[model samples]
Target: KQNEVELVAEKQLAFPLDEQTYYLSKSMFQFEENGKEYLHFENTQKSLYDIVIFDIENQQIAKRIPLHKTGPNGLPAVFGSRPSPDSQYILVAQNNISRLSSINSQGEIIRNYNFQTPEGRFTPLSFGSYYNAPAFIKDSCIFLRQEILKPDMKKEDWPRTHMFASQDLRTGEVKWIPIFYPPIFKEEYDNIAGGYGFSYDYNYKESRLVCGFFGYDSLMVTDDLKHIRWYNAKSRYLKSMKPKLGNSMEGINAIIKLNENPRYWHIMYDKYRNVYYRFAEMPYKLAPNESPYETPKGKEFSVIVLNADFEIIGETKFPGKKYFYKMSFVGREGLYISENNLENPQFDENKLVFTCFKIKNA
Candidate 1:
C-alpha cells in the first residue's frame, strides 16, 4: 500500500516567515553531505534572488543565502538551482543574465560561470530557452539548456536551438548537442509559435539521462553521453487522446496538453528512483474579441514520477485553469498542491489550497 495521508485545512504555520506576504516558488527536500535533510526555498521576491535552507523536521531555517546584491544585467535574477547529490555544493541557473554559479553548503560563492553563445553571435530574443536549469551529472560536470543563434541573423531568423553539456565546471566549457531539431516556419507547424525547452529525467540506478524537449515530440536518453536513444512522445500509445486548452490557476489563460492522454508516467531504473521531476505546459488559445487580460482556456498539470523513462506515472489536473507557479513536491509518498479558489473550503479567497496525496504502487 502507498503511504497516503490527507491534510485538514488548518491555520497557516506560525513561523517567522510571513505566509501572506512572501511568494514561495521552487523548493526541494535535500540531504547534505553530512546526512542532514534540509529544505531549500527559492524566494523570488524582488529584483534580487535569495535562497533559504530550512531543517524540514524542525521547520526552522538553518541558513539564508543572498544570491546577488543588485539585479544583474538589468534583469531580475530568476531560475532554478539545486545542491549536489552529496549536498556539498549548490548549483544555480542565473537567467536574469545567462550564467551558472556554484555555492558551498554554507552559502559562500565558490565559482560563477557564464554561459556565452559562440562569439559574434547573439542570444535568442525569446525567453524560453536562455538559461533554465542545470542538472548535475556528477560533481565534476553539469548539463544546461541553451539556444545557439547562427551568425548574421536576427533572433527570429535563427536557424537552430540546441541543448549542451559542460564537462568541466571550472573552465566554463560547453559541448553543444542537437536535442531538438527546430523546423523552419514554412514547413510543418508553421502556425505554432514556441521554441524548444529541454528538461532532464535521470535514472540514478542505471546512470541514464533522459532529455525531454517541450514543443518537440521526442525524448532522448543517453548513458555516459555516448549511446543515445530517441523515443517519440507521439507514439501510438499517446496519440490516441486529444488535448485541449483552458484557464490556469495563475489567472492566466494557458494550455494543458498531454502525452497521448496518459494520466501518469513513472520513471524507474534498476532499483533507485529519482526524486526530482518536471512537467510541460500546453499551449493556450485566446478567446475571440477578448483582451489579453481576459482569462484564456485550458490549464493542466503533469506529475513527474522520478523514475519513469518518458511517461507520466502520476498526475493532477485543473480542468480549465493553469497554476501561477510550479507545483511543489514533498519527498514523501504524497505531493502537496494548491489551487486558487475561494469557493472551496480547502482554500481561502486568492489563497493557495494545499492538498496531499499518497502514491500506491499497483
Candidate 2:
C-alpha cells in the first residue's frame, strides 16, 4: 500500500543581510559543492549584479561573486543561474542576449556560447526561478526551453513548435527536442503569447525529466526527449484553465489576466524525501490599490504532494500575500520558501527568511 504524504511548515530559517544586499531575487539554488552545502541566489551590492552564497550549516554569508556589467569579464545582466550538477561551474543566462556563459566561482568566464543562427536567435525562456527551472545542466549538456525565434511567424504554431533545446558545452554543438506543449494546451488556448510557461525538474535517480505545464492538469515524465508519459497529478482546486486572451492579440492584457488566473507553477523532485512537490496559484482578488498590470501581491497558492510514482497524496493551500514561493528551493532539512512577500507582516527589506516545509505521512 502507498502512504499519503503531507507538506508541513515545520520551522523557519533566516539569513541576515546588510542594507546593500537585496532581500529578494529572481533566482536561487540549493546544492552541495566541495563537501559543503550552500544556498545561492542572485543579488546586487550597491546596484551591481552579484551571486551571493550562504553556508547552510553556518547560517552566514559564505562568498560573494561579482559579475561585472562592462569590459571583457562583464555580463550585461543575469536572467538565471544554474551551477553544473557535478562540476563547480555556473551557467548564467544574460539579459536580452542570445548568449549563455559558464563561469567559475571567482566570476571568471570559462566558456561562452551564443545561440544566434542564420535564421534567428534562440531565447532562453526558462531562466532559473523558484517555480520554473527551464535551464539546467545534465552530464555535459545544458538543457533549456527555447522561445520562438520569430514570434510573428510562429505565433500560432507555439504548441507544435520544438520547444526544448540542448547544447553540448564540451563540443559546442546544439540539438532540439521534439517535445512540444501538451495537447491539452492546443485545445484550450488559441494563442500563448503572454502566459506562464512550464516547470521542470530532473530525476537523477531514474534519468527522467518531470514537467508541469501551465494549463495541463497531468504531470509529464520523459525518459527520452522524444517520448513522454502523463500522470494524473492535477490539483483539486483547479477546475479549468481558460486563456486570458482567447483569440485576441492583446498581449499585455493577456499577461495581466494570466498572472491572476488559477494555474500551476513549478514541479520539483525532492530527493531527500523521495517525493514530488507541485506548486499552484489559486484565484484571488487584488487589493484596492494594487495594479492589475504589475505582479500580483498576496495571491493565494497551494502545494500538491505526490509519492515517488507520481501519485497525489496531500495538498496544502497557503494564505496569500505572506510567502514568496517563487524564490523557494529544496534542501536536506526540507523545502525552503521565501517569506518576503509584499504584504507579509514580518517582511523586512534587509533580511531574508525562508520557511522550511517538511514532508510527512498523512
Candidate 3:
C-alpha cells in the first residue's frame, strides 16, 4: 500500500484584490525571481484587461500591466498572460484569434505569432479561468494546451482529441502533438457527454509532460512523441469512475449530473518538490428538499502524490465545502489550495486566500 507521503497544513496566505477582478475559477500561476515569488491573475474588471501581478511574500499587488484590445498594436482578446523566463516581458495568448504575442512591461506588443491556417483552427485554452491550460515558454518554444475549433465536430469526439501545441518563436513554426484519451473513452460515457477537457504539466527539469483527463483515472507521461507511458494514478476516494449518462444531452441536468458524480479532476507538477499531484472529486448526493438544480460548488476532494518515477506515494482526502482545488499551484513553500469555495463560511470575494500544504513523510 502507498502510505509514505502526507500533506501537512503549513500556513494560510491571503492577497486582497478588487471583488470584480477576482473569481473562484480564475487560474493562478506562480513564478520565482531573485529569490522572490509572485502570482499572476488576469483582471478583467470594467472591460480592462490587465495582468495583475501579486507579490506572494508582500501579499500585495506588485503591478498591473494593461493589455490593449484596440489599436495598431491591439490584441484580439486576452486569453492568458505569463512572465517570460527572464521576467523581463510577458507572453500573452489570444485564444480567439489563435495568436500569441509578447509584450513589454509597458504592454507594448513586441512580437506576435498567429497559428490560424486554411484548415480547422487549433488554439490554446488559456483564456478566462482554467487550470493546467496556461501556456509557457520552454527551449525557445511556447507550449500550450490545444483546443479544437470546428462547427461540425461531434460531442463524443471531444475526449479523444488534441494534446499539445508547440510553437517555436525563433522560426515561426508550429507543431501539434496528437496524444489523446485512453482506449476506455472509445465507448460513450454520460459524464463526458457534453465535453471532456485536459490537465497537463510539463516538467522542464525532466523534459517530460504528464497529462490527465477529467474522467480518466490514469495519467499519460511522455518525453518524446514516439514513445508514451501510462501510470495508474486513480484516487481511492472516488466512489465510481464511470458516471451515469445525463438524461438530457446538453442542458442544466447534464451539467449537474456531471458535477455530482465522482471523477478525476486536475493534475499538477511541483517543480519545487520534484513531485506531481493529481486531484479527484468524491461523489455527493442531494439532501431532501434540496434544489436539484443547485450548483455543487463545494465538494469533497482528494490529492494523490506521485514521486519522480511516476509512482503513487500517498493519497489524502480533505473535508469538502472549503478548499477550491481548481485554483491551486505549487510553490517553494508547498501546494497552495484556494480557501475561497462558495460554501466556506469565511469566503470573501474581495480577497484571494489559500491554505498551503507541504508533503510530510510518515
Candidate 4:
C-alpha cells in the first residue's frame, strides 16, 4: 500500500545551478555543530566547491559560500566531501588528483594532503574511479581504499585494490589492511580485487566502525582501527536463499555484484532504545545483461537492527519501487533517504527525489 509522503522542504533549482549553469556532483548534510545546519555540494561545471548553511530552526540557507577563487589544482573535482565531527574543517578530494584537502568552514584551504601513488609502478587511472569516498575516523586519522595495478610477468594480470588508513593527517602516513575473499581469490589469483565499499560509519559512543565488504557477504567492523571483525551475510537466513533463475532471486545476486552495490551503509545508535539500527541495499540477483546494476527486481530495501554485540535483533522490509542512493540520520528517530523513481516511465531528467521517515518500531 502506498500513501502520500509529505514534503518537509523542497528547493528546486534550474537543473543543477541557477543562472551560472554549473552541475552539482554530490550533496550531503554537514555534521551538526553550534546549533546550525550546514549542507555542502561540489560544483562540477567549473570545478568549484559551494556550501549552504541553514539554520534548522528557521529552515533557510543562512550563508552561501562559493570557493571558486581558490586554485583549481588544489581542489579535485569529485564527490563525497565530509565535514569533520567537530565541524572545524572539511575534508575534500582534490580535483582529478590523488589528494585530500582540509578547509575551514568559510571555504579557506587550510591544509592539503596529497596521497602519492607509486608512479611507473602502476599506471594512472581516471579520477573518481579508484578512491571516491574518504571517511574521517578521528580528528587526525582518515580511511581510504586505493586500487593499484601490480606488474605480473608469470600469470594473467589484474589490478589489486587494498584498503588503507592514514593515522596522521599532517604527515600523510598510511597503513594497509589486508582482506580476504573466496570467489575473487580463486579467479584473480589474489585476494585484493574487491574495490572499496560504501561510506564507513563510526560509532563514537561505542568506539566502532562498520563497513560492508567482500562482495556483499561481509560487514566488517573495527574498534581501535587495528583489529577487524567480519560479519558474514551468508550465515543469515535472509541471504542464504539460493539464487533462482528467471525470478527476483537472480536479480538480487546480480545487483550485489554490480556497482558493488553497497554504496551507502547507514549505521545509527539508538540511545533511548539502546540498540544499533543498520540499513543497507540488499544484493539482488538479476538476469544477465541488466541495464543498471542497482535496480534489482521488485526494487526492495532491507533494514537490520543489531544489539550491542553486533548480533541481529530484528529485521524488516519496506516495499517500494525506488533506488536508494544516499541516507542520513536526521536528529534521533528520523532518517532522510535520497532515491530515484524507478517506476517512472521516462528514464531521464530529474527522476531523483528525497524523503524523510521516522521508524516507529524496528
- The per-model lDDT (C-alpha) reads 0.44, 0.74, 0.72, 0.46
Task: State residue 138's C-alpha deviation in candidate 2, in Å.
Answer: 3.3
Model 2 CA RMSD to the hidden true structure, in angstroms: 2.8
Two-way TM-score contest, 1 vs 2, winner: 2
State TM-scores per candidate. Answer: 0.63, 0.90, 0.86, 0.66
Best by lDDT: 2
Arranged by lDDT, best first:
2, 3, 4, 1
105-136, model 2: which lDDT tens digit per residue? 88888887775433555455346775567465
Residues 1-362 of candidate 1: C-alpha lDDT, one tens digit per residue: 11121222222221245443243444343444455655565655444356666565455667776655443322235467676664457776666566666776555667776666655243432111112232545556776545534323233443454555453686776566545433322322222222234445455566776665543445568776556686544322223222222223323333222221232222212122343344434334454543454223243444433334444344333444433324343433234444433223343432333344444443
* Residue 50 alpha-carbon offset, candidate 1, angstroms: 1.3
Error of 1 at 246 (Å): 18
Q: Quick one: ranking by TM-score, best first?
A: 2, 3, 4, 1
lDDT of 4 by residue, 321-361 (tens): 55343433343324444444444343223322334454443
Off by over 4 Å in 1: 1-16, 19-21, 26-33, 70-78, 86-88, 118-134, 148-161, 178-195, 216-218, 232-298, 302-325, 334-354
lDDT of 3 by residue, 1-362 (tens): 47899888899889886754655435458887777998877665455567777788888888877777889679877767776753457777777787778888778888988765325455543632355655556678887776545333444564556566677887768876666544544435333343356677778898888878767777888887436898888887664353233444466667666766677777888998899999887888655544556435656888999999989999989888888777888878999998887789998988889999999985
